[PDB]
């Protein structure tokens, strides 16, 4: 049968702006089929991150396509009669949320998932979470230092603000929904290099360098509570300190699916899923095991600190390496 | 959980426009609509508000301390503020109380400014009384020293840095100079006047270069040599620029502080490396929203450290500003550090003030070095209530079976859209949180964190409102709602009523039968019929069987009964006078309110009745005050509220505006069994006691979340003590910053506030003290630092810096 490439409307209004009069289909119906999709291919080939994103959809496409004479349909968000492999991408935005290679449970594709990443590992930058109608009435010491800082909305995307005059926006935003708080560079913008998985045998070795961050601690200690060599995706690594050692580089992000906004990123992931065999019948087993493994878990830690997804009740501050309730 | 009386500000008046000042006890202090607020800015929250005039507030200005201090004179703090009913109150801010008052004629004061000379005498005020009258007043007696007349328009006035006799006033045709300015008799003659060649905004003296002055114009900058009478330096703005607002100048350093029509605030330093003074910009702001409801009206800056500015807005908040140090002309740090040179192996503290900063003045053009840069931070930020027409609730009363997690919230809604949550307890803003996109008409609770509300739309053209009720749970935000899609297609909604065991829930419409639904299920249970009369008041009973009772149009009483979905009626009651607007029920006690001011003290024990007339125009709301065997109510009229009493009919007290009371009521509420919430028409909030009779507050006796560093508000006894043993830091071997090491019999009370008052310090302070190459002088420069006073600030600079040049 065929493949389900789950979607948002993201992908259609990057795509919007004969192509643009097909593309209400694409955000009214939805239903795009093969027989849609092949007619589609024409207007597709026929076409700076508009060009980015229009690129990385063609190679996907006909990728996901050969024999590994399979056909794929591209439904958006009785699912065991049509379709028998659900593919997602990442990153799922937070307006939106048989097998599944992406995430199993909405928890995943949230902010909840960026504590527990930290709180498992014990390196990151520093978080403040606060829930909504939270006031600030002085600007935290921990972040006076910083220069760029990175502000999350729960539902919206992130985004970068200066810290000169923070306080406006965060009194403001914080009415409507919870606000996270996260320092982004001490002088400037900071570097983010994206590391794909599963990791090849012949990158786990070596020497710590910008082309090979495979022997990162960090790295390391998610290996064996998470399980990412049933999965594919990237990490997102942030440096704070760019203008290399171990010390300046933590983790930020994790998302599960096939990325879509750049071009290199996304040839590496495709060919990990045909040369490691993440789509043969016996290799999707073991993901039926953890794909309860790793929800329990989430979920447990979610109702620890508690007492769609869940809105936050209390206030967390990660520091030191050390999670917590924030006095005040 | 103990409640004490206390006023909640919000926005300020157009009279408020230049109603500010920071002193050298390092507090902050505004003008309120009739109030003075005074707040800290290490900590950004509201210590004592004062309110004693019955006019707007116009000036305010803090004392001045350039004097030994003793026990004959101790650390005491001293405010003054004038009205525009021309009276002068001197403020001692530890209790709530006046020491004097000064009253002449019935025309605003223009202008108050203490005397920097307190040599002989430390309680010399000058105010201008209009048209053209200066007065010499006393601060201790409120004795007249001195009356002198003029023949022109005195706007403003400044006094000479460096000579204490020379004295300039600024007129509607020019500029009076005084040279002859004392004390003991009055100026001689009319003075030696100029004329520039209307349109002035400020005037006053240069403190870092002597016999200098700025003249403010909106596009220019002006600085004045006196003994040539001609112009040295232009500051001008570009073509494609905003206009200039006010200027504040420096005295450590030689700078200005430009505040600008939008909002932005600039600091400019003279260039002194690299014929006319030129003036450099060395760090920027960022520009806030500018309205036509929303408008920036004075800046303040730090006389201590010249370190920090705060902005006054109109809708009432306060932004802090802090200057931040880094490593056009160039600029280069300082080379001694607290009065004496330093080495490169010893701890440093840039930021601790100005002088710290950037080295001193300089000549360019001559043969001479780190690289110095400043910028702006924003570091606090306070807000207050929104514009008038609250909408208030109180949180169900303290019982005996939620003792454990009872908390005294309270619900203020506004116009916005947005609910306010207080704690009444520390005075600090809870949550706020947007709700609806119109006005909020009412909020009611349903338990310990949760509550209801509701709004309505504007009308069309045939009357039909969109309605809109939302549950809000306080802890997690989530707003959800409660009818559902109902449409944008009805009837408004006049009142809801939740019962007193959060049970059932009534929704009242204009020409709509009733709805009874459920707070726990949230479904609808039993609608009435067509043929329903009118609601026009509605009351459950305090006493899962439920009783409410309401009228009609025509005055008769129906009394109802409620069974899960069955409804009964259980009686009816003969009309009896006019048409009934407000019922309360509590006991056997039934109390109805009239049109004509009548108030009929219905009683279901012997069928009687007792209408005892008002005198008053109308009622608006009654409500009871809780507790068991607490009968007593307050009643809401068009002109003011009273308390009565239902045991004995006999007004206790009343509370009439324009009589008693300057300000309106809008709406009334019972925060405990002997306090009551009294919510006013320009934008405040006031907790009263039983008679409404306003209290001195006073700050002995407050409960702060945050300890804040004051050596005025300990006692005389205290502040010399503290300050002896901080100057003789190595105590017996070791270095300790608390009492409990050192031999001093006193009470444990004041040992624990002197602990107390040290463990709010700073940490690079305190680390600054634990440090033995700390010697002596910077010990003795950073304590009169800490402590705001000028004499020593001024001896102590000199004396070391004299000592290390003839040392060597």
């Known amino acids: 049968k065929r ?10 209004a990057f795509l919007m702006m004969n192509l643009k009069s097909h593309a209400v289909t694409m955000f009214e119906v939805g239903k795009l089929s093969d027989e849609s999709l092949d007619s589609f291919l024409i207007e597709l080939e026929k076409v700076q991150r508009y060009f980015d994103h229009a690129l990385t959809l063609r190679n996907t496409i006909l990728f996901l396509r050969h024999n590994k004479g399979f056909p794929l349909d591209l439904l958006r968000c009785v699912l065991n009669k049509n379709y028998t492999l659900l593919v997602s991408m990442a990153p799922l935005t937070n307006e939106i949320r048989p097998q599944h290679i992406g995430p199993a449970i909405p928890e995943v594709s949230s902010v909840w998932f960026k504590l527990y990443i930290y709180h498992v590992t014990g390196q990151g930058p520093p978080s403040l979470l606060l829930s909504k109608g939270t ?43 919870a606000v996270l708080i996260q320092g982004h560079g001490l002088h400037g913008i900071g570097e983010t290099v994206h590391v794909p998985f599963p990791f090849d045998e012949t990158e786990l070795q070596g020497e710590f360098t910008r082309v090979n961050m495979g022997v990162h601690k960090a790295l390391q200690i998610l290996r064996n509570r998470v399980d990412l060599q049933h999965l594919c995706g990237y990490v997102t690594m942030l440096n704070a300190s760019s203008q290399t050692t171990e010390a300046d580089w933590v983790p930020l992000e994790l998302c599960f699916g096939i990325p879509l906004f750049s071009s290199e990123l996304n040839r590496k992931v495709c060919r990990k899923i045909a040369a490691h065999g993440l789509c043969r019948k016996e290799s999707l087993q073991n993901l039926l095991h953890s794909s309860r493994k790793l929800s329990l878990q989430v979920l447990n830690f979610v109702h620890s600190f508690q007492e769609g997804v869940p809105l936050p009740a209390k206030n967390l501050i990660f520091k030191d390496g050390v999670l917590s309730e924030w006095s005040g | 959980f103990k409640v004490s009386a206390r006023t909640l500000t919000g926005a300020l008046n157009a009279h408020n426009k230049a109603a500010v000042d920071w002193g050298w006890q390092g507090l902050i202090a505004y003008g309120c609509h009739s109030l003075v607020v005074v707040i ?26 350039n004097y030994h201090h003793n026990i004959g004179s101790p650390y005491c703090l001293r405010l003054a503020s004038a009205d525009v009913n021309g009276k002068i109150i001197v403020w001692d801010v530890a209790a709530g109380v006046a020491q004097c008052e000064i009253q002449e004629h019935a025309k605003p004061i223009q202008d108050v400014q203490w005397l920097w000379n307190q040599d002989a005498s430390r309680d010399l005020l000058l105010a201008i009384h209009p048209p053209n009258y200066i007065v010499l007043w006393n601060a201790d007696t409120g004795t007249k020293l001195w009356k002198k007349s003029y023949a022109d328009n005195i706007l403003s006035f400044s006094f000479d840095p460096f000579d204490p006799s020379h004295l300039t006033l600024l007129t509607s045709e020019g500029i009076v100079f005084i040279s002859d300015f004392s004390p003991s008799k009055p ?36 600085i004045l040599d006196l003994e040539v009478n001609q112009t040295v330096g232009v500051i001008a703005i570009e073509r494609t620029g905003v206009p200039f607002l006010q200027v504040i100048p420096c005295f450590q350093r030689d700078g200005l502080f430009c505040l600008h029509e939008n909002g932005c605030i600039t600091l400019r330093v003279r260039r002194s490396y690299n014929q006319e003074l030129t003036y ?11 309205t036509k409801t929303v408008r920036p009206f004075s800046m303040v800056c ?32 300082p080379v001694s550090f607290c009065g004496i040179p330093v080495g490169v192996l010893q701890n440093k503290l840039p930021d601790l003030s100005l002088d710290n900063m950037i080295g001193q003045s300089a000549i360019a053009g001559e043969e001479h070095l780190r690289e110095v840069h400043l910028k702006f931070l924003l570091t606090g930020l306070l807000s207050g209530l929104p514009a008038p027409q609250f909408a208030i609730r109180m949180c169900p009363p303290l019982t005996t079976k939620n003792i454990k997690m009872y908390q005294p919230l309270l619900a203020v809604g506004t116009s ?6 207080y704690h009444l307890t520390s005075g600090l803003l809870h949550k706020e949180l947007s709700i609806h996109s119109c006005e909020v008409k009412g909020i009611e609770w349903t338990s310990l964190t949760s509550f209801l509300s509701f709004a309505t739309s504007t009308p069309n053209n045939m009357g039909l409102v969109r309605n809109e009720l939302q549950l809000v749970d306080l802890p997690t935000g989530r707003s959800i709602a409660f009818r559902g899609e109902r449409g944008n297609d009805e009837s408004a909604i006049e009142m809801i009523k939740v019962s007193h065991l959060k049970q059932y829930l009534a929704v009242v419409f204009r020409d709509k039968p009733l709805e009874l639904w459920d707070v726990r299920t949230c479904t609808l249970l039993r609608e009435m019929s067509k043929n329903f009369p009118t609601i026009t008041a509605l009351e459950w009973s305090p006493s899962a069987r439920e009783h409410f009772v309401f009228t009609d149009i025509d005055g008769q009483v129906y ?15 003969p009309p009896d006078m006019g048409s009934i607007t407000c019922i309360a029920w509590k006991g056997d006690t039934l109390v109805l309110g009239d049109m004509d001011g009548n108030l009929n003290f219905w009683d279901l024990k012997g069928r009687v009745s007792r209408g005892i007339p008002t005198h008053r125009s109308w009622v608006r709301k009654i409500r009871f005050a809780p507790g068991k065997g607490n009968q007593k109510l307050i009643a809401m009229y068009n002109d003011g509220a009273e308390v009565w009493d239902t045991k004995e009919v006999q007004m206790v007290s009343s509370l009439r505006s324009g009589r008693n009371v300057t300000f309106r009521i809008l709406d009334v509420d019972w925060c405990t069994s002997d306090k009551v919430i009294l919510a006013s028409d320009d934008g405040c909030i006031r907790v009263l006691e039983m008679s409404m009779k306003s209290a001195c507050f006073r700050m002995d006796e407050q409960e702060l979340t945050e300890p804040v560093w004051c050596p005025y508000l300990l006692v005389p006894r205290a502040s010399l003590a503290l300050k002896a043993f901080l100057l003789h830091q190595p105590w017996n071997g070791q270095y300790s910053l608390d009492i409990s090491h050192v031999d001093y019999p006193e009470n444990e009370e004041i040992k624990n506030l002197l602990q107390e008052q040290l463990n709010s310090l700073s940490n690079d302070i305190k680390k600054l003290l634990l440090d033995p190459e700390f010697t002596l002088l910077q010990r003795c420069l950073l304590v009169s630092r800490l402590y705001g006073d000028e004499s020593e600030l001024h001896f102590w600079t000199v004396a070391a810096h004299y000592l290390h040049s003839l040392s060597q």
């Open chain 2, 40 to 65: 800290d800015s290490i900590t950004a929250q509201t210590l004592q508000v004062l309110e004693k005039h019955k006019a707007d507030v116009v000036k305010v200005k803090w004392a001045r301390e």
């Open chain 2, 559 to 573: 009394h109802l009964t409620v069974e899960g979905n069955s409804v009964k009626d259980s009686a009816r009651i």
């Open chain 1, 135 to 177: 006031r600030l009435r002085k600007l935290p010491d921990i972040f006076q230092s910083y220069d760029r800082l990175l502000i999350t909305s729960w539902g919206h995307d992130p985004g970068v603000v200066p810290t000169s005059n923070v306080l406006t926006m965060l009194n403001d935003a914080l009415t409507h929904s």
């Open chain 2, 187 to 222: 100026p001689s003659g009319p003075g030696k006047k100029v004329y520039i060649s209307n349109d002035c905004l400020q005037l006053a003296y240069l403190p870092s270069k002597r016999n200098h002055m700025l003249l403010l114009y909106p596009r220019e900058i002006l």
């Open chain 2, 280 to 290: 450099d910009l060395r760090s920027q702001c960022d520009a806030i929203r500018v």
């Open chain 1, 3 to 12: 493949i389900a490439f789950l979607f948002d409307s993201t992908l259609t």
């Open chain 2, 302 to 333: 730090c006389p201590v450290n010249e370190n920090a500015a705060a902005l006054v807005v109109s809708d009432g908040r306060v932004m802090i500003w802090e200057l931040k140090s880094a490593v056009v002309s160039p600029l280069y740090s």
């Open chain 2, 416 to 421: 916005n859209g947005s609910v306010l949550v």
